Design a protein around this ligand. Sequence first.
Ligand SMILES: O=P(O)(O)OC[C@H]1O[C@H](O)[C@H](O)[C@@H](O)[C@@H]1O
Ligand SMILES: O=P(O)(O)OC[C@H]1O[C@H](O)[C@H](O)[C@@H](O)[C@@H]1O
Lengths: 403, 403
Amino acid sequence: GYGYYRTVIFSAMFGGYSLYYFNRKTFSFVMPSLVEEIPLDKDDLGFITSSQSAAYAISKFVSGVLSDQMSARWLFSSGLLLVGLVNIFFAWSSTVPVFAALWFLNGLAQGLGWPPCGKVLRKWFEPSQFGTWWAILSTSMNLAGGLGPILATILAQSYSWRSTLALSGALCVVVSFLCLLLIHNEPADVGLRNLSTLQELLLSPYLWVLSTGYLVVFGVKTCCTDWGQFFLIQEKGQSALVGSSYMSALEVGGLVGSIAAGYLSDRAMAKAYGNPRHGLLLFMMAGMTVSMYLFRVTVTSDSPKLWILVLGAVFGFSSYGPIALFGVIANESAPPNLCGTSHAIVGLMANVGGFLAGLPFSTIAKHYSWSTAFWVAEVICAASTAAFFLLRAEEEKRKAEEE
Amino acid sequence: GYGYYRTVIFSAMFGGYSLYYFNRKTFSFVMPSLVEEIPLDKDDLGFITSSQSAAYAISKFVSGVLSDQMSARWLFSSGLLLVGLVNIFFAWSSTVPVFAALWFLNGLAQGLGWPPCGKVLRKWFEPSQFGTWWAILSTSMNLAGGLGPILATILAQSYSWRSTLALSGALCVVVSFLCLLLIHNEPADVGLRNLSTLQELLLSPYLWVLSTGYLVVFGVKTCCTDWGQFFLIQEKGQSALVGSSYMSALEVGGLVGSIAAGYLSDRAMAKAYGNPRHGLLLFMMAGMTVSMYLFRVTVTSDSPKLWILVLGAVFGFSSYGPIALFGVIANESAPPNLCGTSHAIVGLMANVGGFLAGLPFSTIAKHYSWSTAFWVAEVICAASTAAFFLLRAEEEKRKAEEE
Ligand SMILES: O=P(O)(O)OC[C@H]1O[C@H](O)[C@H](O)[C@@H](O)[C@@H]1O
Ligand SMILES: O=P(O)(O)OC[C@H]1O[C@H](O)[C@H](O)[C@@H](O)[C@@H]1O
């Protein structure tokens, strides 16, 4: 049947991208035994993670451009095979520049992971279900991040870290051959019914307004995810338990935000005036701005724990939600032969927004105050969200004037 | 006549791009009076320069893509006008995040500067003269860098730094209107005789082998320019006067290398088997590898000053030379409507090679030794240069087999 290929290919991509994120952060989960066996400076550890971040930032865009042309099955399986062979070679090595070079190749293959999954989810799933299964597939990132330290502590108690990364690399090689076997690109490959130029995509204004939206939303996400603890410890005087539980509540609210963004977006798509994924997306950006206002103004030193966890969960539900919806709309607004380029340009905007949110936000916070910095982030987000409400109201006016 | 428009438009672009590089580094030349008037931390200064570097790295590629479509006169003049207005607004301001935001906009407009000059040099100059005037136009970068601290010290002795940057911004606004007036795009605009798709450019293998060549050459240039002083002070025990005079000799040899690369390349073009710019380019990469071998092995603690200045000048003649020739060939191998995209992809390779040469080279140097790091750079350069000799020998074999 059709549902058989549906659930088998989604389970194969779920296991595959789960092992991708489990090996995107394996050095981070195996850090204690690694610094116990050989001493590594903190600058070297930040350097290895930064080299993976740079390789992953390049390979987002390069893998989108290659996933438009090359078939997604072989690309996904070759990336996961390079992940497995890189982690086995990482277990063979015992020195810092070889750690960095191999982990750079891991960052390249981790970039190579996701755009094949995006292409296969576009080909197999009609847009009545594409957003919610996009959400459940990106939930494997949270699943690997949640079973990271638990399985890492179990495998470090039961095995050495050399054998731990050898088992992770061997598991990813075996699952890469199983994902070469089980995944199919399109239904026309299996006998089922299968369901523009690049200059037209680059000159399309919808892609660039989605670009600016994802820049704003990922900048606000990176600002709060990196600096909410510093905004609560230093200026507002909350305790470190409150800041850590705030960040955990923001992660849980963000998981629920991705899931409910995908599901309510597919409910709005099946129930229906333009794109049906905008009425949820702009409501979530409005919830982002309202949660930032309530977090900047109403939280004080005497504010209770329940209210600040509520604001963490409301910001999580309203920040990872628009990131998942921007991923869905970027994979959806483009033609099926140019979808990976659209999602790759949105990943380039992730890189630009992460730069504008990481280091200059700390400078604005250090020179003026932390409240002035989150006021700048709130003003940029509120001006952007009000601009999007004005834009879609103008487009409703245009669709009324053409009648 | 034709030579009138030739020399007037080249003098206008020479003055314009000279004021571009003079305002690319104006904060660096006005640093002493600025840190005297208001205290700024070293991390803040490195942050302002890094924000300019990031904006310039983005705006290389964005300005290449826009300079293919938008006319080069208005683009060049609007970039220089934004440079002038940004430096005037920088003189109005007195705080570090506004310094960073304005200097980010300066980095954007500095990226916007050069690809219009590349398009106008391609349109006005036949390839019998295009390389040498490319070299003389990129020599205005060295001219502004050489008259930077001298004119900065004179204007700081005669004026305040607020008035210094106000005069620099006013000069760039007036010269931006003069470059709107004097520059012409093509000879068909002035009544003189004027002399493919993007997917065909991206799928062209010549552009990507030029990409890997510029990655290798700019990586070796960034390695030696950033770490030759550290390779001579620490491991080989030379003095700081010898290291500083080595770096000055490398800059002078690189200036002569850009000039003689452009001139000997246009001599080889007018005297003529494929591209005539390869017989100079690969000889300069071979001279780069030979100079690195002689600098790694023959330089010792007892090596004289004259020999190490000779190796600095030979490496300079053989490193900025291939960078200028890669710029010429990137502006030349593409069609005239897609030349800025080709030079923009080569600028993206500048960014990638600068990343692979800046921070991991210090890690390879710190963990193993400095000699092992420059041995890695020499082995990558020698393997790349031998690969290019094998590739052009294979292409000579192909042009013999087609006969
Ligand atoms: O591991 P990270 O740096 O958080 O990036 C993870 C993200 O990378 C890309 O943008 C993918 O489209 C996302 O599905 C994924 O969640
Ligand atoms: O100022 P820099 O960082 O040294 O960059 C300067 C260089 O930028 C671009 O690559 C231009 O094509 C070059 O002509 C110019 O020399």
